[PDB]
């Protein structure tokens, strides 16, 4: 019901060991989210998925396929 952060004392949240993309930031690595009998949890932020690529001298990787995607950027004028 209470947790100590580096920013200060946080009361009313539950510390979990799961790490994923959060919504409401707090600070010093601690971030808050509301998910499901429902409460507000606080945890340490995720950097994305783990990928370790292979390395050797003799192995190259050539892509055989392509996918054309459309992205949208909005700049005010």
């Amino acid at each position: 019901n209470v947790f100590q952060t580096r920013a200060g004392c946080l009361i009313g949240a539950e510390y979990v060991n799961n790490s994923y993309e959060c919504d409401i930031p707090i600070g010093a690595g601690i971030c808050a989210s509301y998910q499901t009998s429902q409460s507000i949890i606080a945890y340490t932020m995720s950097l994305g998925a783990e990928n370790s690529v292979a390395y050797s001298n003799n192995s190259i990787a050539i892509p055989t396929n392509f996918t054309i995607s459309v992205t949208t950027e909005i700049l005010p004028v």
């Binding site: 003799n58 192995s59 990787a61 396929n65 992205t71 949208t72 909005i74 700049l75």
Partner: peptide, 20 residues
């Protein structure tokens, strides 16, 4: 009050390992 850009890009998808 702005502009909306639509960016057509070239993204490769599948991968296959070869001997070089």
């Amino acid at each position: 009050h702005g502009v909306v850009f639509l960016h057509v890009t070239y993204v490769p998808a599948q991968e296959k390992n070869f001997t070089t």
